[PDB]
Amino acid sequence: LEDLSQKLESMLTFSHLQQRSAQEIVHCVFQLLTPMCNHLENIHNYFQCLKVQEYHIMSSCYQRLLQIFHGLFAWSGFSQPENQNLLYSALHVLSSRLKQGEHSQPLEELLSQSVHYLQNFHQSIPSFQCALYLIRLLMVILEKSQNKEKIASLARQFLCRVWPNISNDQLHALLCIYLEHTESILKAIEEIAGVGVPELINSPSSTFPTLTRHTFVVFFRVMMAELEKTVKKIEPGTAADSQQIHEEKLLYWNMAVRDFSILINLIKVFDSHPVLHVCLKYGRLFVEAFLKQCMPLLDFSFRKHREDVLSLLETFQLDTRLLHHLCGHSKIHQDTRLTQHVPLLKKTLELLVCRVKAMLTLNNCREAFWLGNLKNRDLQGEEIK
Amino acid sequence: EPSSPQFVQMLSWTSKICKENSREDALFCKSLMNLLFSLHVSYKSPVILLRDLSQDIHGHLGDIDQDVEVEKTNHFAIVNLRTAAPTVCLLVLSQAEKVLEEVDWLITKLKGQVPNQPVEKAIIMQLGTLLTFFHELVQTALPSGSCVDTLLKDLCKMYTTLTALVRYYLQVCQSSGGIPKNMEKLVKLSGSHLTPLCYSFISYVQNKSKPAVVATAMARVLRETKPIPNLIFAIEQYEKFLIHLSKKSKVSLMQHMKLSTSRDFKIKGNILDMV
Amino acid sequence: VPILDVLSSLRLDPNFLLKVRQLVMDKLSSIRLEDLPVIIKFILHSVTAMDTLEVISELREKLDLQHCVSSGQSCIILLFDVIKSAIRYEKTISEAWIKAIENTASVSEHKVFDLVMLFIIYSTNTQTKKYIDRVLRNKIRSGCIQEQLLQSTFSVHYLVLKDMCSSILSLAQSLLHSLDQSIISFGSLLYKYAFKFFDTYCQQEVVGALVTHICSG
Amino acid sequence: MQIFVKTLTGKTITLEVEPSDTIENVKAKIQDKEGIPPDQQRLIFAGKQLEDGRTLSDYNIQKESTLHLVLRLRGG
Amino acid sequence: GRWDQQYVIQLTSMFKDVPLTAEEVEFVVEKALSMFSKMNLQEIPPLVYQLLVLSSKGSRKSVLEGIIAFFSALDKQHNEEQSPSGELRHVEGTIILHIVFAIKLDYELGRELVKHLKVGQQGDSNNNLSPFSIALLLSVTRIQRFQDQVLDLLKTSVVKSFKDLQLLQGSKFLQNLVPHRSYVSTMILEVVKNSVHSWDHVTQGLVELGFILMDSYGPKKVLPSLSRMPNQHACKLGANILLETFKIHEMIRQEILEQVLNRVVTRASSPISHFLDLLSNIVMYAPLVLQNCSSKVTEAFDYLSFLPLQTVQR
DNA sequence: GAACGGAACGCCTGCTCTGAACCTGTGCC
DNA sequence: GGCACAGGTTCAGAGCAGGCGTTCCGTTC
């Protein structure tokens, strides 16, 4: 199976192989894998429901199998219709791995049967990588259609289990998969950021484990990136759009902003190179999204829905300030690696200021825009001199 | 011919007219000055010229502190409250830009090489002189119009040029172990005189606030946003490259400069009357 | 028709000219082939600067070029010679044409005449080559211009492009350099059919060009 | 009349021929006095690749003027 | 060890077949290139052949550096002796031809060459180039893969030469600092002046460059100084090249003229003044050739209604 | 000795250079 | 009290440079 996974990886994403077409190889592989490695997969499940070197081997076999399945099912010749008769026979096989009689069945029903079969492995698995392959497999089976909830429950189980080491990138990919399928990204980070704390309270390893003093980094990274990606998707309409839609947009904004505030406040406890490296690199992206896709809405809904906007901006100052402090901190402890990403941040903040000025300028309240220079603090709260 | 005595007496006479006469017309003044630069540059650099003028502007127009007592009209006569604000600011600023083009051009040529010593020396003397120019300008209560935008975009040009000088020095001092004292003194000046004022200037411009098609209003306002940010970005980028050089010199160039001042805003109880 | 010869060759106001232009354009598809080049020549120097996109679109959607299909191929060569005489300098019509067809890149039912014109105008104007280049590189990408058009193109409209060998070959060469194997596929199909239906000189030229792309790129 | 050729080993070689004679004649003489056939030869004067059907009058080639050779091995 | 100046080529060729490091190929090439000075001339090209095919597996930039230093310095020696040719330029031509033909195999050499003579920062274009290097590049041009990059290089090299000279002239400070190097325009005309020595694989490239310049940098914004003044010294150099080329090379005067007339005729949508000024200058040198383009001449006279007035008149 | 940060060659974005015309403001008849 | 010239401004286009995206080597534990 090491050998066969090597060959598929080469072929899709070794000479005697390459003198054949992918279609030929996959066409043969249906007959060369499906019913008889399904037996072997079932046998692994039987074993893993329950000397150590065999266990290591059997885990390796399990991941190699599922890797083969993913390498199979993601073939871009199942996009085109020719290889899809093959897929219909394959699905027939996977469904008939439990139950027979439902012949020439609707495609989607057969998908449900296959994935419902693939559900039952969730507890057997010993290691991370297996889980990941399984999930990626399911997701690429399922896109042939709501169903996110099943992926989400599964991902949450496999983020929440014990996992007796683990490499960061695996987890990165798993949590990307979690968050892009969850209902509410915002309350997800909020839950996880009232839980970034018990890493400090309890264990010098939490109630959401896979969260060592190491692993915080990757959580943070993904929470920042996926949040910034989320809010970028919003389109501000016009005053033709109802106050109602504006209200829910603003609440959405407000939740995202306080989320961001909560994220950034975690820097004082977790000072390092790379956690800083993240908030610098991501903060600017957040703010830019805020400029390009809030400010026009505020221009629209100023004169009616103003007090919300003022609470919003006032709140947003209270981490903007932290970010400026961070820039200063980064300059003082003269760390090349962080300072690289300062000046675009700076430039981005001042541009926020000036955009607000312009925002009032349109609404005929320009003179009210007063400035004040800022006290110089570190991250904790001083007036450093 | 530039070196010919007739060029020389001509230039000198011109300068006497510029030292002598008020002459409250604008264009007349503008034409004289343009004449003067277009001669002078063929003779030698125009910076001490620029310095004298900037001082005279400061003396005539005011200061942002509203409380420093100053007059240096004696230098160059062709100034009033009518003359010097919306005209001569621009003109002298456009001459400074020509200087900064010349110097960035030198610097590119030096990185070309990889002769050097007098090159750098002349560059630094130039830069320091007109850095002093910018000092006397930046303390000034200019108007909210064009000359103010012009100045921001010439500062950006300034800092950028310094950044380029610094980047030159990166590629040198790593090989040898350098920063001759001139450059140090220059950065000392860049910190002390210019930068903190820059921030104070911006306080002035932004706090200074005192019918138009909505789409073209959008065009106007969004054109009005960029330069101050582009300034920031240039400053910070000076600072960043200093850090690098600090790391690769065994010197704190940042012991000279200061914690970068930054700007938080507010809103007040005026919106109420407007609605 | 000889009225149109005369009237085309006269000083007349653009308003009566526009009247008679419509008196022609209503009677386009109701005609034999024999008469069309002298008609079309008149039409090519009846247009304004502002009725250019409208009349190119009107014309291009109205025509057959296939109902007529050894007087057929001979009088279509004369039609194309009339087109060669009008495209050469009147850029207000040539750019109008380029942009009249790029704007009809939505519908994949745009036909032989659209590509014949691409080749002719690519050969014609040294200057507007790269707008054509970019238009076709976007066009090809959309699941538009495909083989079957090229097939019939070179199957019937070969005598016109028989002359424009190196035009085709330059296009092909410029295609095969880049990525997006659709590009490369089409540029290869171009060589194949071009080599197929053309003279032995053309064939000699093709293989020369091919071995050049081989030793070189 | 006398002329020179030099090659990839630096074998300065002296060729006696009339200027009205042609280039393939010199290739024959190279096959004769040096054993190198014509088709492998590539003859140059002063940055011009010399063809067969020409002569030394065509290229203004004169007494003791030095030619250059290489071995154009098709395969190698 | 000291090298018997006669039989050093064979010695050099011995290093060819031994597989060496970069260090040992570097040692041999640097010493063997230092040997160039203390020789007769005519032995050098086949030496260069062996150097090159060895240089295919080692340090090649080093060889080109040494080559160009050698030939640029000696060109300047000749120039100062002027203010020893009929062999010298001949050997140069042959060398150029060798290196072109060797690039014909290995293209990495092409890219390493061009990186060496990449202007990049403009001050490199005041130590990079000589007339000799330029001649090299214009000979290189003939490879269809290299007719873009080389010409973008020469073109943009020439425009930046003029942007420097304009800016230097309009300052005195800079004149008090710098001593005037050579500027690309005058190098290119020395080359053309010295193309009488009659290697003509250049001349097609030259022609091509002249046409590029006049095509690109000719009045199109004109139907300032920055966009105007040093993109007219370009055009003028184009036309100046062609006219000068034309006075020397009686093989070429036909093809120039057919291309020019194609340019004059098909356009006159665009302004083509520079071309007609050129054409007048050409004919006023030697009208006889215009018998040979009698064909295109008479073809124009069928188009001479559809052309506008000024065209026709000049 | 390994990994993570510094580093190089190409394409797209956007920003700038420039021109041209409209329009509106001021001074003189 | 109105008309003409100027100057600002703005838009449209086009062209080009730099930064990030992919891919690899140095430096610091």
Alpha-carbon Rg for chain C, nearest whole angstrom, is: 18
Residue-wise over D32-50: b if at least 16 C-beta within 10 A, else e? eeeeeeeeebebbbbbbeb
Within chain C, what is the greatest distance between any pair of CA atoms? 61
Q: Is residue D10 part of a domain?
A: yes
Q: φ and ψ at A136, to 5 degrees?
A: -70, -40
Question: Would you tell me how many other CB atoms lie within 10 Å of the CB of residue C88?
Answer: 16
Enumerate residues 6+ apart whose C-beta is below 8 A from A222: A172, A175, A176, A179
**E130 CA, F13 C1': separation in Å?**
38
A370: left (phi over 0), alpha (psi -120 to 50) or beta: beta
Q: Are the Cβ atoms of C127 and E143 closer than 8 angstroms?
A: no
DSSP codes joined into one string, A147-158:
THHHHHHHHHHH
Give the CA count within 13 Å in the CB-facing half-sphere of E274. 28
Q: Report the distance separating Cα A117 and Cα A112, nearest Å.
A: 8
- Protein-covered nucleotides on strand G (Cβ within 7 A): 7-11, 20
* Token pair belonging to B9: 């007496």
Q: Are the Cβ atoms of B108 and E122 closer than 8 angstroms?
A: yes
- Taking contacts as CB-CB distances below 8 angstroms, the residues of chain C near E269 are 89, 91, 127
Q: Are the Cβ atoms of D68 and E46 closer than 8 angstroms?
A: yes
Strand D66-71 versus strand D2-6 pairing type: parallel
* Token pair belonging to A81: 């219709």
Enumerate residues 6+ apart whose C-beta is below 8 A from D76: none
SS3 call for E217:
coil
- Protein-covered nucleotides on strand F (Cβ within 7 A): 4-6, 16-20
Which residue do the tokens 């010295």 mark? E194
Q: Is strand G within 7 Å of residue B259 (CB)? A: no
Residue B215 per-residue DSSP state: H
What is the length of chain A? 385
* Token pair belonging to A23: 């279609």
Using a 10 angstrom Cβ sphere, with 0-12 exposed, 13-18 middle and 19 or more buried, the burial of residue A260 is buried
**A332 CA, F6 C1': separation in Å?**
21
Q: Report the distance separating Cα A171 and Cα A160, nearest Å.
A: 12
Chain D: residue nearest E91 by CA?
D46
CB E95 within 8 A of CB E45: yes
Q: Which nucleotide is nearest to A277 (CA to C1')?
A: F5
Q: Report the distance separating Cα B236 and Cα B234, nearest Å.
A: 6
SS3 per-residue string spanning E144-161: CCCCCHHHHHHHHHHHHH
SS3 call for D49:
strand
**B212 CA, G8 C1': separation in Å?**
15
Q: Are the Cβ atoms of C217 and E270 closer than 8 angstroms?
A: no
**B212 CA, F23 C1': separation in Å?**
14
* Token pair belonging to A65: 């199998």
Q: Report the distance separating Cα A190 and Cα A293, nearest Å.
A: 23
Q: Is strand F within 7 Å of residue A214 (CB)? A: no
* Token pair belonging to B112: 């070309």
Which residue do the tokens 């392959």 mark? A133
Q: Which run of H or of E encompasses E67?
A: helix E61-82
CB A170 within 8 A of CB A129: yes
- Residue A65: what residue type? L
DSSP codes joined into one string, A100-164:
---TT--HHHHHHHHHHHHHTTTTT--SHHHHHHHHHHHHHHHTT--THHHHHHHHHHHHHS---
Q: Are the Cβ atoms of E94 and D49 closer than 8 angstroms?
A: no
Interhelix angle B117-138/B89-113, rounded to 10 degrees, is: 150
* Token pair belonging to D41: 């030869």
Q: Report the distance separating Cα C196 and Cα C199, nearest Å.
A: 9
The answer to whether E144 faces chain C, any CB pair under 8 Å, is yes
- Residue B124: what residue type? I
Q: Report the distance separating Cα A157 and Cα E258, nearest Å.
A: 79
- Taking contacts as CB-CB distances below 8 angstroms, the residues of chain B near E124 are 112
Enumerate residues 6+ apart whose C-beta is below 8 A from B248: B170, B173, B174
**A171 CA, G23 C1': separation in Å?**
24
Q: CA torsion angle for C118, C120, C125, C130 (degrees, to 10)?
A: 30
CA B189 to each of CA B158, B173, B183: distance values in angstroms, whole numbers, following the listed order? 13, 21, 10
CB D38 within 8 A of CB D44: no
Question: Domain limits at D54?
Answer: 2-71
CB D71 within 8 A of CB D35: no
Q: Which nucleotide is nearest to E223 (CA to C1')?
A: F19
CB B261 within 8 A of CB B195: no
Where helices occur in A182-306 by DSSP H, the ranges are 185-193, 198-201, 216-232, 243-264, 274-300
Q: Report the distance separating Cα E43 and Cα E36, nearest Å.
A: 10
Interhelix angle C181-197/C200-216, rounded to 10 degrees, is: 150
Residues 187-246 of chain B sitting with CB below 7 angstroms of strand F: 226, 230
CATH number, domain of D8, equals 3.10.20.90
Query: Of A348, A355, A368, which has the smallest distance from its Cβ to B271's Cβ?
Result: A368
Query: Of E145, E266, E306, which has the smallest distance from its Cβ to C216's Cβ?
Result: E145
Question: What angle (nearest 5°) sits at the alpha carbon of residue E176, between those of residues E165 and B102?
Answer: 50
Q: Report the distance separating Cα D5 and Cα D12, nearest Å.
A: 6
Determine the distance from the C-alpha atom of residue A89 to the mean position of all C-alpha atoms in its chain, rounded to a whole number: 34
Where helices occur in E141-292 by DSSP H, the ranges are 149-169, 173-177, 184-194, 201-216, 233-248, 253-266, 273-285
CA A299 to each of CA A293, A359, E190: distance values in angstroms, whole numbers, following the listed order? 11, 6, 65
Q: Could you tell me the sign of the dihedral formed by the alpha carbons of E140, E142, E145, E149, in that order?
A: positive
Strand partners, D55: D22
Question: Would you tell me how many other CB atoms lie within 10 Å of the CB of residue E156?
Answer: 13
Q: In what side-by-side order are the strands of the sheet with D66-71?
A: D13-16, D2-6, D66-71, D41-44
Q: Is residue D31 part of a domain?
A: yes
Strand D41-44 versus strand D66-71 pairing type: antiparallel
Strand partners, D69: D43
Q: Is residue D20 part of a domain?
A: yes
Give the CA count within 13 Å in the CB-facing half-sphere of A228. 19
Q: Report the distance separating Cα C176 and Cα C195, nearest Å.
A: 16
Q: Report the distance separating Cα E88 and Cα D57, nearest Å.
A: 21
Give the CA count within 13 Å in the CB-facing half-sphere of B118. 6
Strand partners, D66: D4
Where helices occur in chain C by DSSP H, the ranges are 2-8, 14-25, 36-44, 52-62, 71-87, 91-102, 112-124, 129-141, 147-156, 159-162, 165-176, 181-197, 200-216
* Token pair belonging to B48: 């001490």
Q: Is residue D17 part of a domain?
A: yes
Q: Which run of H or of E encompasses C178?
A: none
CA A267 to each of CA A196, A224, B259: distance values in angstroms, whole numbers, following the listed order? 11, 13, 21
CB A370 within 8 A of CB B207: yes
Q: Is residue D76 part of a domain?
A: no
* Token pair belonging to B138: 């930046």
Q: Are the Cβ atoms of E266 and C217 closer than 8 angstroms?
A: no
CB D46 within 8 A of CB E89: yes
CB A334 within 8 A of CB A272: no
Question: Would you tell me how many other CB atoms lie within 10 Å of the CB of residue E236?
Answer: 17
Enumerate residues 6+ apart whose C-beta is below 8 A from A203: none
Q: CA torsion angle for B72, B74, B79, B80 (degrees, to 10)?
A: 70
Question: Would you tell me how many other CB atoms lie within 10 Å of the CB of residue E256?
Answer: 22
> How many independent structural domains does chain D possess?
1
- Taking contacts as CB-CB distances below 8 angstroms, the residues of chain D near E7 are 10
Q: How close E18 gets to chain C, by Cα (Å)?
A: 28
Question: Would you tell me how many other CB atoms lie within 10 Å of the CB of residue A222?
Answer: 20
* Token pair belonging to A95: 């469904």
Q: Is residue D15 part of a domain?
A: yes
CB E293 within 8 A of CB E257: yes
Using a 10 angstrom Cβ sphere, with 0-12 exposed, 13-18 middle and 19 or more buried, the burial of residue A206 is middle
Q: Which run of H or of E encompasses A336?
A: helix A336-339
Q: Could you tell me the sign of the dihedral formed by the alpha carbons of B40, B43, B48, B50, in that order?
A: positive
Strand partners, A298: none
- Residue A321: what residue type? R
Q: Find, among A282, A316, A381, the residue nearest to B265 by Cα.
A: A316
Most B CBs within 10 Å, among E119, E127, E173, to test the B interface: E173
CB B233 within 8 A of CB A343: yes
Q: Is residue D65 part of a domain?
A: yes
Q: Report the distance separating Cα D25 and Cα D44, nearest Å.
A: 15
SS3 call for B180:
coil
**B216 CA, F22 C1': separation in Å?**
14
User: Resolution reached, in Å?
Assistant: 3.9
SS3 call for B250:
coil
Q: Is residue D63 part of a domain?
A: yes
CB E114 within 8 A of CB E149: yes
Helices and strands (DSSP H and E) totals, chain A: 17, 1
First to last CA, chain B: 68
Residue A210 per-residue DSSP state: S
Using a 10 angstrom Cβ sphere, with 0-12 exposed, 13-18 middle and 19 or more buried, the burial of residue C55 is buried
- Which long-range contacts does D61-67 make (Cβ < 8 Å, 24+ apart)? D61/D3, D61/D19, D62/D19, D63/D1, D63/D2, D63/D3, D64/D2, D64/D3, D64/D4, D65/D3, D65/D4, D66/D3, D66/D4, D66/D5, D66/D6, D66/E42, D66/E87, D67/D3, D67/D4, D67/D5, D67/D6, D67/D43
Residue-wise over E87-101: b if at least 16 C-beta within 10 A, else e? ebbbbbbbbbbbbbb
- Taking contacts as CB-CB distances below 8 angstroms, the residues of chain D near E93 are 46-48
Q: Are the Cβ atoms of C88 and E269 closer than 8 angstroms?
A: no
Q: Is strand G within 7 Å of residue B274 (CB)? A: no
Q: Report the distance separating Cα B51 and Cα C23, nearest Å.
A: 77
Strand partners, A370: B266
CB A320 within 8 A of CB A349: yes
